[PDB]
Design a protein around this ligand. Structure first.
Ligand SMILES: C[C@]12CCC(=O)C[C@@H]1CC[C@@H]1[C@@H]2CC[C@]2(C)[C@@H](O)CC[C@@H]12
Length: 243
């Protein structure tokens, strides 16, 4: 069980948003706190990804690219699992110091996207996803979004993605076929949610000065440089099933 030992060992711990819960639940304060959480989580996502089995097999340029394409889905999927585990998906647990209730969902101007994130969180309960299945599915999310014109070394990526699909199947083999259908469907469902949030954050970055929303340095870079490749169709999710 080397592979699972590794995924358990490298799993990031708790990250706080730094949100001042004393201030009013305004759009500006909530989204500025979410952006800071994003910057703080990205540090952990990079360190995690670089530690995954096989990741250093990819070209160095491909290593950064897959992180910068996949972070939104990785972070939403992990938040959905934290929300399930902490509060049975009742609220969205972005961080211990930034839990969205109904009011914050409305004030954030993301109510509909939050509804979809809550549905994803609830699937963890409905499907009785185990921690092992969660860890293997989250690793596969890293290898689920790539440029249409290919990566620098596409073959190395294809081999690695194949290996993570095999590991997900092995975890299931510990019926089997039905479970695999369910888990791949759940993985695909993260992508449309990530696309909605990519569009929202891109639009918010462009108008950020007008609405007093702060974007930290790495977030502003990734959202203006890499996110538009996704929104313009140059970088696309790899779906299991026909959409
Ligand atoms: C990835 C984050 C932050 C980390 C997390 O737990 C999930 C969450 C999903 C919404 C994202 C947010 C980062 C900041 C974004 C991108 C905002 O600009 C708009 C939507 C936010």
């Amino acid at each position: 069980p080397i592979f699972l030992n590794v995924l358990e060992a490298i799993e990031p711990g708790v990250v706080c948003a730094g949100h001042d819960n004393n201030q009013p639940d305004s759009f500006a304060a909530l989204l500025s706190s979410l952006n800071e959480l994003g910057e703080r989580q990205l540090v952990h996502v990079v360190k995690w990804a670089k530690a995954l089995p096989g990741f250093r097999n990819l070209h160095v340029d491909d290593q950064m690219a897959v992180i910068q394409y996949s972070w939104m889905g990785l972070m939403v999927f992990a938040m959905g699992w934290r929300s399930f585990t902490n509060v049975n998906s009742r609220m969205l647990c972005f961080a211990p110091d930034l839990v969205f209730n109904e009011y914050r969902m409305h004030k954030s101007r993301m109510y509909s996207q939050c509804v979809r994130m809550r549905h994803l969180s609830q699937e963890f309960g409905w499907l009785q996803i185990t921690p092992q299945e969660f860890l293997c599915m989250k690793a596969l999310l890293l290898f689920s979004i790539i440029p249409v014109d290919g990566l620098k070394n596409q073959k190395f990526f294809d081999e690695l993605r194949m290996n993570y699909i095999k590991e997900l199947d092995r975890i299931i083999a510990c019926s089997c076929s039905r479970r695999f259908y369910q888990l791949t469907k759940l993985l695909d469902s993260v992508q449309p949610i990530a696309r909605e949030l990519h569009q929202f954050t891109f639009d918010l970055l462009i108008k950020s000065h007008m609405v007093s929303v702060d974007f930290p340095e790495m977030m502003a870079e990734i959202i203006s440089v890499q996110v538009p490749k996704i929104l313009s169709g140059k970088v696309k999710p790899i779906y299991f099933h026909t959409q």
